[PDB]
Structure formats: structure tokens, C-alpha cells
Amino acid sequence: CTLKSFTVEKGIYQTSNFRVQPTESIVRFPNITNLCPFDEVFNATRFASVYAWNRKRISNCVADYSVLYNLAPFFTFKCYGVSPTKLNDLCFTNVYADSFVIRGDEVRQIAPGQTGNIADYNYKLPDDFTGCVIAWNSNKLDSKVSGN
Amino acid sequence: GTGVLTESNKKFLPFQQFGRDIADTTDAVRDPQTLEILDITPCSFGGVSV
Amino acid sequence: TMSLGAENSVAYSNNSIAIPTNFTISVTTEILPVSMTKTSVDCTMYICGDSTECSNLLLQYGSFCTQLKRALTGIAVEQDKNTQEVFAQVKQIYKTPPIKYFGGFNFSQILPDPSKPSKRSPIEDLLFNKVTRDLICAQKFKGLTVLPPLLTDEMIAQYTSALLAGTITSGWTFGAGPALQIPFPMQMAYRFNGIGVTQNVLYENQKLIANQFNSAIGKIQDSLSSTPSALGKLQDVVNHNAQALNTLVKQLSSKFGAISSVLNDIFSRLDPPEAEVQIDRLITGRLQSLQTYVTQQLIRAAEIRASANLAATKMSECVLGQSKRVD
Amino acid sequence: ALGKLQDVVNHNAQALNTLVKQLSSKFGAISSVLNDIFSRLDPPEAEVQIDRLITGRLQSLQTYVTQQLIRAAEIRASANLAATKMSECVLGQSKRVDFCGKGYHLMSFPQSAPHGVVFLHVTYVPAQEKNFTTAPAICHDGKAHFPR
Amino acid sequence: AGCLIGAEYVNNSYECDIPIGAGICASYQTSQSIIAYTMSLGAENSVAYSNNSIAIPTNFTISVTTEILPVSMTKTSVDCTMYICGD
Amino acid sequence: IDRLITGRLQSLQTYVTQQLIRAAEIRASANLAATKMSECVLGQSKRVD
Amino acid sequence: AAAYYVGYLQPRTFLLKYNENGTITDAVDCALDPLSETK
Amino acid sequence: PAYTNSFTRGVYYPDKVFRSSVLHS
Ligand SMILES: *[C@@H]1O[C@H](CO)[C@@H](O)[C@H](O)[C@H]1NC(C)=O
Ligand SMILES: *[C@@H]1O[C@H](CO)[C@@H](O)[C@H](O)[C@H]1NC(C)=O
Ligand SMILES: *[C@@H]1O[C@H](CO)[C@@H](O)[C@H](O)[C@H]1NC(C)=O
Ligand SMILES: *[C@@H]1O[C@H](CO)[C@@H](O)[C@H](O)[C@H]1NC(C)=O
Ligand SMILES: *[C@@H]1O[C@H](CO)[C@@H](O)[C@H](O)[C@H]1NC(C)=O
Ligand SMILES: *[C@@H]1O[C@H](CO)[C@@H](O)[C@H](O)[C@H]1NC(C)=O
Ligand SMILES: *[C@@H]1O[C@H](CO)[C@@H](O)[C@H](O)[C@H]1NC(C)=O
Ligand SMILES: *[C@@H]1O[C@H](CO)[C@@H](O)[C@H](O)[C@H]1NC(C)=O
Ligand SMILES: *[C@@H]1O[C@H](CO)[C@@H](O)[C@H](O)[C@H]1NC(C)=O
């Protein structure tokens, strides 16, 4: 098969390599049980501005990406560096959560390598980012007849 | 780009603005406002041997 | 249809033999390349033309620049060693005595002349006068530099003069051990004994042999000029190096599928997300072109190393002695 | 003394070390570890991210093979020269100057060496020379006598 | 060949130790410091050539020299799958 | 189509490189054969083996 | 006493020789005769 | 009508780039 012929001459021929395939599967995840709090960075009211954006550290917990999908206008859930799925098996080191106020379209500018108006003066992502940017277009909360 | 700007003696034509050579690289440009032919040449460079 | 040669028919017979009654001393010329132009490339400047993003992106392609630099340094050291083993074979620089009477033989064409400040012979000057902004500066501004050889032309001329002095004054004794002086007619008698001819043939026809040698030297000096292809084997490698440098420079003007061969316009017109995918193709293409240049230079350096080994063998056998090897 | 063998030994060792170190390079990808790319990104993006690594490693391996071919050609030339020297100095007495040593070749002795061979060339170097007055020939009774 | 900064140029002529280029060689000689000098091609020996004099050796010294020659190279064999992406 | 063009150009370059290596080897063999011709047919060489 | 020589152009390749003064002196049609293709 | 041979005429400067001692195509 390797010589592409039916008549093999006298000699020694190398064909392929042998490998002992596995038979089990080990995980050995840490002993952490408490979940990560995703209600103080998503359900919290009165988010800060774009320039003075807050930053909360999430650590020593398990991040179950199931309560995140709770709002109906949950679009623009684009992940940079990873995939939207296959996140319930990765064991990261640190997770940060920020908040901004996009005017009406600057959500497309929050991405590695994208420019615009609010793209280099308030919050910039380099071309090494690993995360998921998400906006839910909150309009009924931070709006009134008297204007905000 | 980078390069040393020196006064060149290469006479150009009234419609020419850039300048090439055998190596197909820029080596002479015409100044926009004050018409004068320059000579673009890279800075000094080489190899450091110890 | 090309003719292989004249149609001859040797009159073979069981009882006939052809013994020569005369002879003609002939001098032949053989050209052999020894070294090349030791070149060195600038990896960061050739692939990236005064661009910081390209320089930061090239570092992720592994240590290929180190491989290319080591290959070029090895080629340069190999060419230097070839020149050293071809020319620098003796450990003593001999000098021609003031009296230049060697029995009738006139070595004025091979021996160096003090009038020329280059200390070269009339034959060496003719050879140097036939083997030849500008191009060497336009290619230098793209990373292609040319390192000068270790042994200059004056040192090679002094080595050649020392070899000639040792061959004329001592013969073949200065290659084995100490230089033992010997009259040139006796040296020629020994050379004739080396090919079966007795000494009387030379000692009775010394003037004729000297005249034939002088005429052959003059004919060689004349034939070195007005020749379509005389120093062909050196011009071959010169043109090979020239064409290699020319194509390596012209490969920068290629697009390799990108929008343009220039980097500033791509960086100023496109966004980094697409600028990376637009510039990585150019980087890979220039790297592949430089790798092809390096491997072609390696093949050419192996060729020149073989030629230099042959030249050193010839210098050790034909010059430092009398070899019985035919042709 | 044993520089010509250590030269090729170190050349091969450095070639192997460089071929191993080329695996650490990313070739523009997000990571040199392919398992991380398979575990983080989706297959549609994992394939595009791994094609670059595969192409880079294949190009490095082809460059290594070409360099090994050139070095093997050089070693073959050196081995042909060594076999010629063996057959002409050990199996006989060659008159080629500066081939079986520096001087008049008498005999040679081959010695084994790691990835090479060492010849012990025995030569004949004259010494303690003295100057005399020579003559081409002599004649006693009107007939020139030449040295036989 | 360029410009050497850190070594003084002496007017003597020794054997080449560290090749620099254009006939310039460097060495660590003497107050030890790195010096630059034009390499010497060897000692100058003027053979006394005469049309009636010959030099015949009256003795000899048997010399045994050495010559190193590479013969074989290490035989390698790469595994494509294990090198490109193992497991 | 740029990918196919680059791949086929790289294939042709590899072929030319292998052909150059084989041509250098055959040139060395031909020089050896010519030397053997000149030293064994056009004369009698005392070179052992 | 007037006469013009109206001609027609077409996509062709030409090898132009630039003088040291910056003017064109000669040119090769690159497709007329085999010698032009060789040049 | 009449016809006339164009004896190597009709060559113009293709671009606005200066070149000296260069055989460009
Ligand atoms: C979100 O906040 C609102 C207002 O405080 C509260 O009524 C609701 O229960 C919260 N939801 C979650 C999931 O915490
Ligand atoms: C631009 O203005 C300067 C200042 O008067 C003048 O010398 C120059 O000729 C102007 N440029 C052009 C193209 O007229
Ligand atoms: C040489 O000998 C052969 C056989 O003995 C004979 O046929 C031939 O004629 C001879 N040659 C001459 C020139 O006579
Ligand atoms: C050999 O030839 C030379 C030149 O052709 C001539 O001068 C000489 O007399 C010849 N020797 C003879 C005929 O013995
Ligand atoms: C040697 O030849 C040159 C030119 O051919 C001549 O000038 C010179 O006088 C000759 N030597 C002798 C000793 O006659
Ligand atoms: C030859 O050797 C002797 C003694 O070794 C020495 O005196 C003499 O100068 C040398 N040269 C000549 C030409 O005799
Ligand atoms: C032999 O050499 C001596 C000394 O150099 C010289 O005087 C003499 O003229 C030479 N013989 C001939 C025939 O030139
Ligand atoms: C030759 O040289 C050797 C070693 O130098 C010495 O032992 C021997 O006596 C010398 N023979 C003569 C005749 O000088
Ligand atoms: C180029 O210019 C020089 C002086 O600048 C002149 O001597 C020469 O004739 C010119 N070449 C031409 C017009 O072809």
C-alpha cells in the first residue's frame, strides 16, 4: 500500500508508526462548588459611563453560562478568542466584568482592531483579547421624557 | 517612510513627480510647493560584529 | 549535422612503429573558480520596509532569520577557507633573485613587475582588466550587502610570486621540505627524465626549447586578448550572483496575492484585522523567496567548493611537482 | 585537532534543536498548542487557525530536509575523498604531492574515528642540506658523459 | 570591511588569529589588550639561485602527520504526524 | 486561486531545487568518469584501486 | 499642403530604454519579430 | 486611400516616474 505496487522487492521498508491509544478520560477539576455572581454585573442598575467604567474581579467560583441567557434582546453575543459554546469545560484564571453606555451603534466598535469615535479614548481592546462582548440594548430603563 | 533628504542634481521633467531606480524603489521626489528635486536615501545601517 | 572530428586511420601493422623525431613545447591555459562574493542579508529590513507592525509580526515566525544568517556566515567562512587552501599552501614567501638569467627562459610575463603599483605580472593585469546611482548601492539599501574577502589581491599576488619563485629557483623541492636551489636547465633535465626523455635531448637543444617556451608564452599572452569567451568560468559565477541579487530585489515588487507590494499603503488604508491577513501573505512570500535564495547560494557554494578542491589538487600536483596523470 | 567531526556533530545537533524549537512558534496563530485551539475555538475557526501552524511546521520540515540533503552531499564528497586517500596511501604508495602528507609519501596508517577516519601519513622530509658546485655533464676524451 | 572600535592598530605583522576582513586580523597579545594588524603571509626566504650551485640534502627526518576526514553523518528519521501535531 | 497558484509555485520550486541537487551529484559523477577515462584509457595510471 | 497619419493603438508590451538624462532613446515591440521577443 | 509605414514611432512616457539607465517594460 505504501509503495503503490503489487510487487515488493527484497529489502527493508518503513510503512507507518504505532501508537498506544488511550482507554480512559481524566479531568481532576478543583474542589470549588460556589457559583460566580452574575447578578451584580448584569442585573445591577445605574451603570457607570464609558470613560469611568467599573471593573469587578470574578474568581474562586464556577461560572455556569446558563443564567446569562435571560433577556429577550440578548443579541450581539460575539466571542473573540473563544467560541460561544464549549465554555462549560474551560477552567480560566480570572474574569473581569465592565459596564458602558453605548450611544446607539458603538457596540460594533468594542472589538479587537475596530476603530470609530469611542474606540481609543475610553475603552480599547488589543489584538490578543479572549472573551465575549454582549449588549442587550437597555432602552426602557435609562430613558424618560425629561431626558437623562 | 524614512530617508535622508539631500539636494539632487538629477534633472526631472515638468510632469514627473516621483523617482525610481534599477532596484524599483523611490530615490528622488519633487517638493510640492517649492519645486526642487531631492534625493531620498536610507539612513546608515549595517552589522554589529563582536 | 555536427562533425565529431577528422577521419583518421592509423596504419597498424605487425612490424611498423612510429617514433617521433622532434617536439614542440606548448603552454595551455585552464581557468578555475575559487571563491564567490560573500553576501549577507538583513532579515528585518528586507522582509519589512521601515515598518514597526511588520517587525513585531515577523518575530512570531520562529528563528528563521538566525538560520539564514548562520547559513550565509558558513558560506562566507567556506569561501575564505577555499581561498586559503588554494593560494596559501607554502609557509615561506620566496623572492626572485636580481639576476633573471635562467638559461634562456624569459619569465618576464609571469613574474611581477615593480613598475605597476599592484605588484602583478603583465598576464595578471590582463586578467584583471577583463573580469569586471549604480546597482551595488541600490541593492545595499535593501539589506543585500557584500562582505570583502579576507585575503586581498596584493596577498594573492604575493602568494603567486612566492610560488613562482619556489618553482623556478628550487623546482619541486620546496613543496616537500626545504627549498633546495638548482639551476633551471638541470630542473628541465629532471622534468624531461620524468617523462622518459633523456637529459641529452635537453642539453643539446636548450636554445630551441627556450625559444619555443618564449614563443608559447607570447602566444598565450596574445590569445588572452581578442577572445570572445576567455575568462568564461568566472564571468559565469559573477553573472549568476548578479542575477540572484537582481531576482531577490525584484521579488519585493511582487504582490503574492496581496493588494500591493508596499506596506505603508496597506497599513494606512486597511484595518488591522484585515491588515494582518493582508501582510502575513507578503511576509511568508518574502521569507520563502529568501529561503530559496539561501538554498541556491548553498548549492552554488558547494559547486565552488568542489571547484576549489580541484584547483588546490592541481596547485599541489602540477605546480609543486611533476604529475604523471594524463590530461 | 578533531574539529572536522565536532563540526558536523554540532551542525546536526543545532539543526535538530532548531527543528524542535520551531514548534514553539505560532506563525501568526493564537497559540502554539493545537489542543488549546481545539478546546477553545469552534471547528470552523479551529481549522483556519491550525492550517497556519500545519503549513509553518511543514515548511520548516521541508527546509530541514533540504539542508540535510545538501549536508549529505557534502559528506558524500568528503567520504569519496577519504576512500580515494585510503586506496592511494594505505593500499600503495602515491606520488601525488600533498595528497598522502606533506613530503615524500612512504606509508600511511588508517585509524577509526567517530563519524570519520584519521590517517597517519608517514612522510620523508630531507634536512641538513649543503651547497655544492654542479655541472650539466663532463667529457674526458671529447665525449660528453651525462649522469645516468 | 567596516570600522573597528575597541582595538588598536599596530604596525607589526603576526599570524592571523581572528579574521576581520580586507587583510585585517585581531589577536589578544601584549598590558594585555586586543590589537589589530595586517596578517603576514609567512617568513621571507630568498633562495640563493645560481647557474652552477645545487643543494643536496645530507640528512632526513621522518615525519608522521595526521589528517581528519568526515565519513558518515548521523542517520535521522522524522515522524510527520507526531511532529506536526502529536496526539 | 492565489492559494493554488502559491502552492503550485512552491511545488515547482521544490522540484527545481531537487533537480539542482541531483544535477550537482550527476556532475560530480561525470567529472569522476571523465577523470577515470583520461587516466585509464588515454594512459596508464599507477593509482592503486 | 496638409497631411496627417492617423493610426490606431492596441494593448502591447514595450521594453523602453531610459537614458541617463531621463529621456527615452529606444524601444522594443516585444511581439513583432522573434528577435524582439528575445530582446 | 493612401498608406504609410510607421517607422518606430508612437512611443510616449507611460507614467510620471523618473528613471535613469533603466530598461523598464
Ligand atoms: C433583578 O433585579 C430586580 C430588581 O432588583 C429583581 O426584581 C429581580 O428579581 C432580579 N433578578 C435576578 C435574577 O436576580
Ligand atoms: C506655494 O507657495 C510658495 C510661497 O509663495 C511659492 O513659492 C510656491 O511657488 C507655491 N507653490 C506652487 C506650486 O506654486
Ligand atoms: C599481421 O599478421 C596477420 C596474421 O599473422 C596477417 O594476416 C597480416 O597480414 C599481418 N600484417 C601485415 C601488414 O602483413
Ligand atoms: C624541430 O622543429 C623546430 C621548429 O619547427 C626546428 O627549428 C628544428 O630544427 C626541428 N628539429 C629537427 C628537425 O631535428
Ligand atoms: C623578455 O621578453 C620581453 C618582452 O617579450 C622583453 O622586453 C625582454 O627583454 C625579454 N627578456 C630578455 C632577457 O631579453
Ligand atoms: C650554500 O650553503 C653554504 C653553507 O650552508 C653557505 O655558506 C652558502 O652561502 C650557501 N649558498 C651558496 C650559493 O653557496
Ligand atoms: C651565471 O651567474 C653569474 C652570477 O649571477 C653571472 O655573472 C653569469 O653571467 C651567469 N652566466 C650567464 C651565462 O649568464
Ligand atoms: C641526522 O640527523 C639525526 C637527527 O637530527 C642525527 O641523529 C644524525 O646523527 C644525523 N646524521 C648525520 C649524518 O648528520
Ligand atoms: C545629458 O546631459 C549632459 C549635461 O548635463 C549633456 O552633456 C548630454 O549631452 C546629455 N545627454 C543627452 C542629451 O542625450
Side-chain angles (χ1 to χ4, degrees), chain A residues 39 43 45 67 70:
Chain A
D39 55 77
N43 197 23
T45 61
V67 79
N70 62 331

Side-chain angles (χ1 to χ4, degrees), chain F residues 15-27:
Chain F
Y15 171 77
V16 169
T17 301
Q18 297 292 340
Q19 194 72 13
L20 284 171
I21 297 180
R22 188 175 294 101
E25 191 273 343
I26 293 296
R27 178 203 60 92

Side-chain angles (χ1 to χ4, degrees), chain C residues 21-22 208 212:
Chain C
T21 63
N22 212 6
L208 179 61
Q212 289 182 1

Side-chain angles (χ1 to χ4, degrees), chain C residues 307-323:
Chain C
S307 181
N309 294 329
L310 179 59
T313 302
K314 289 189 179 300
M315 183 76 65
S316 299
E317 295 185 7
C318 313
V319 179
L320 306 183
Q322 185 178 6
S323 62

Side-chain angles (χ1 to χ4, degrees), chain B residues 21 23-25 27 41-42 45, chain C residues 45 133 138 140-142 249 253:
Chain B
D21 55 352
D24 195 5
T25 180
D27 61 329
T41 168
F45 63 94
Chain C
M45 189 175 184
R133 56 188 179 185
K140 188 262 180 180
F141 294 153
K142 292 182 176 300
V249 170
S253 60

Side-chain angles (χ1 to χ4, degrees), chain D residues 19 57 78 121 123 128 132 134, chain E residues 52 54 58 63 65 70 83-84:
Chain D
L19 193 62
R57 297 182 183 188
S78 180
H121 299 288
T123 59
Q128 298 181 2
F132 306 98
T134 178
Chain E
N52 51 13
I54 195 179
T58 61
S63 61
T65 179
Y83 176 81
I84 294 183

Side-chain angles (χ1 to χ4, degrees), chain D residues 128, chain E residues 58-61:
Chain D
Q128 298 181 2
Chain E
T58 61
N59 202 331
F60 51 90
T61 56

Side-chain angles (χ1 to χ4, degrees), chain C residues 12-15:
Chain C
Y12 180 83
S13 178
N14 319 329
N15 215 23

